[PDB]
């Protein structure tokens, strides 16, 4: 595996709402991945219908698009080996219910309309959503200081 | 399930020694649960043989009373959807050996005999344990400003 | 001077509301302090009142007794050496924007209409407060297994 | 003073580089502002240059854009009342070694040189800085669910 | 079994490079156990091959020997009941990947040459390993002030 | 001022009774400062009464040697431009009592004869209470992969 592989993170209205911001983000930076894009945005309903548009067909759908749209997110890339699916796993089960406290979920979050954070489940839809929510140029290349400490060649 | 499940948590006379009243209480807290009733007690032997009487049989019962009158208690309610089961998951195994790190005993304690605290086991038994150590009128109605970020509902 | 000084402490409607019990409680945990009493309460008009008798002619009286019976107020006894006047160190400046980084309301609060907590000014006043917010039963008499590491023989 | 009084905040390389984001962020967070930009950059030496334009004359001028060309930054604006005055407070002195522990740069940074962050220090500046790092529509305009706790009217 | 039992915890060089010494520390204080020895050392290329003995025919020894030189570590000794099993508990899977959020290695670490801290498996590892990195005479006799609220009589 | 300029920082045996050693270490790990010497012991009575020495005609002298006898210490050297002064700052005043929330006493203590740590107050007394405390070669050469974020030099 690569650790140059990329995942897209977003923190969800209710996680900006609720003053989450600081503590997810050190969740991925304690692990030692890498922040290569960061934006507070609020995006348009037609970006979020295709964020999410494998779901049209769900009975949820509208309720989740309104939900995402009711206030500001903070789009993330996030970088490093096994980054998408570790970054599941620091995110925790979709369902709350279901979450291991320890996780951001099973730390923060109750309800699955109202599960805190989005983060991609695989690397093709990875970089589906990179592209959708950022430009290119928004994609900051740099060196971590303890990348040789964080991996073995 | 509903959002307005109530269970009982105290915690034991060992974690109020240890000096863990605070953090219990975030994690509750934090995941989004409303406190509704609290208070510091000394509860009488015969209550506390009450609260166990389902184990009255056991070995362990005449020390677990007497651990549990050792030192003050804090006793509190918690709201929320699966408050009941989810506290157990906050709570960890009930022999912290068995319990995982990121749950209270997996952060806290090592003794089955001294396991910091307690959670009701079941949403009849939470409404007995509530009813067995709490007034009616120890139970404050509020609605938490953050309700609608938490819950879908 | 002794250690067995005792004050009041309280988290009022603002510091409950933005789940900050479990860190306040924490601030004095760690420093060595007893807890002695604890309840979520949600006192009569003619308590909080009286509570403020001092501040009856000032202006905004009217309105801070209002908020502070807009929601649960969290109300402690916290014991030993100088607690009354530590106790109102760590609570920090009474308008936030006075106070220090590393205070409760250095950390935590912007407004002094808002300023998340309230702490006895001095020892005659917290006696008077302690005996306006609590009845004597419900006060713990116990022994910090810690006592004789916090304080000098 | 006005609620809606916003500065630039930035976090400088050496805070990026050493795994600060998170709990730079939590401690704006915590205090009760609010996040209204954010934007992980990597500016052009031109940028840099106009906004420390002041200190050209300074004899550390040509080190400290390079150290500021030396990676990313996380550049963001916070709203609150006296939010430009607090977040100085916040942030500590400009040299670390007069700082406070508590302040960021007092918990956190040592060199004058390498002090982690950046905060306006008038509201004149403040909306010069903010124009020179943010396009407007960068500005996301919300109401936090707890407003009415942290502000009095 | 006995609360005496006694385990080998070490923070590599890459967990001390990365600034994990408070925090992993106070990962097991937390939990209850007692820190009977500690040192900071950069032990000899020698006893690091006699500490990995058994793995001398993988095809990652001399890499991790040679990584294992390459900076301080913080080596310990951890004395409570069953402190071996559940030290390795907290530390977490060997490969971080298979790790779970809240222990040492799923907070902190992503790849198995670099998953930050060392622990004995099994009681007879754990007294060879005190004997290969410690003298007797720096393991430190003390009773903690809170045994009695870990562990049941 | 020289960045290898080292201090002498001990945790006293309330300190470690009281389950601080983590927290410690991490207020001098986060400020950047490096650990380059660490050991747990149970020094002689001679050798505390010399590192006290200057206090041998003062009342509290005899009370003072039998305290810190009365339990481990953890004593360290940390390594960073003016750690002297910057250190003290960090431990707070000698007496709680007069401390700054945000400090390690400000934090954590309230009695002068249990004030958890002990730093030294002079360039000259640390180099004295360094050679004191420590044999040559339990002083670690390393250089931190961080040190150009830390440091401007
Ligand atoms: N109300 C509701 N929302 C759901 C349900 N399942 C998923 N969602 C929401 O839709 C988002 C996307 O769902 P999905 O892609 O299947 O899960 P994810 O990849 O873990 O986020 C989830 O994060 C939830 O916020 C459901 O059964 N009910
Ligand atoms: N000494 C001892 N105490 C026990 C044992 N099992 C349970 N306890 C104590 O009894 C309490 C109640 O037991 P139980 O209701 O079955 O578990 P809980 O609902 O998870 O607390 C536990 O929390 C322990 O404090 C045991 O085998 N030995
Ligand atoms: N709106 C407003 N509220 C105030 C003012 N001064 C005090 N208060 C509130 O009144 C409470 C009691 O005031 P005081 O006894 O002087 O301050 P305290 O003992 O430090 O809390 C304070 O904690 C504030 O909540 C003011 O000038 N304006
Ligand atoms: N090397 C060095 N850098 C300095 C000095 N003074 C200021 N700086 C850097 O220049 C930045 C801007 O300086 P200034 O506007 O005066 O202080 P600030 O507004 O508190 O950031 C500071 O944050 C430091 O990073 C100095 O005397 N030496
Ligand atoms: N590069 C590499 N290093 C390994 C591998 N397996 C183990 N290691 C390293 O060797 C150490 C000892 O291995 P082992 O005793 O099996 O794991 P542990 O007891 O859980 O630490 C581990 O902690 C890793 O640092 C591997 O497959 N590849
Ligand atoms: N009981 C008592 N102990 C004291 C007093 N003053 C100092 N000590 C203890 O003596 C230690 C050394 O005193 P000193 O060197 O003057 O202060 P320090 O350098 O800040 O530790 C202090 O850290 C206290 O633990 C006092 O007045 N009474
Ligand atoms: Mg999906
Ligand atoms: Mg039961
Ligand atoms: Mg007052
Ligand atoms: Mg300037
Ligand atoms: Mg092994
Ligand atoms: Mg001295």
């Known amino acids: 595996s690569m650790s140059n592989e990329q995942t897209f993170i977003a923190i969800k209205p209710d996680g ?11 969740r991925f930076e304690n692990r030692g991945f890498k922040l290569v894009a960061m934006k507070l945005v609020s ?3 037609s970006q979020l219908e295709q964020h999410y548009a494998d779901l049209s067909d769900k009975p949820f759908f509208k309720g989740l698009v ?4 009711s206030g500001p997110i903070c789009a993330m890339v996030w970088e490093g ?3 998408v ?10 369902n709350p219910l279901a979450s291991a406290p320890g996780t951001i979920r ?7 309309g109202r599960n805190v954070c989005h983060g991609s489940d695989s ?5 589906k959503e990179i592209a959708l929510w950022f430009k290119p140029e928004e994609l900051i290349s740099w ?3 303890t990348f040789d400490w964080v991996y073995e060649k």
Chains 1, 2, 3, 4, 5, 6 share one sequence.
Do not use: C, H, W
Not at 106 to 112: C, E, L
């Open 16 to 26: 900006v709402q609720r003053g989450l911001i600081g503590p997810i983000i050190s």
């Open 43 to 45: 995006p348009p309903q």
């Open 66 to 69: 309104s939900y995402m749209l």
């Open 81 to 83: 080996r096994d980054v």
């Open 85 to 94: 699916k570790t970054g599941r796993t620091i995110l925790g089960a979709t």
């Open 106 to 112: 099973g730390d923060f979050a109750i309800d699955v």
């Open 123 to 127: 690397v093709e839809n990875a970089k």
């Open 143 to 145: 060196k971590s200081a």
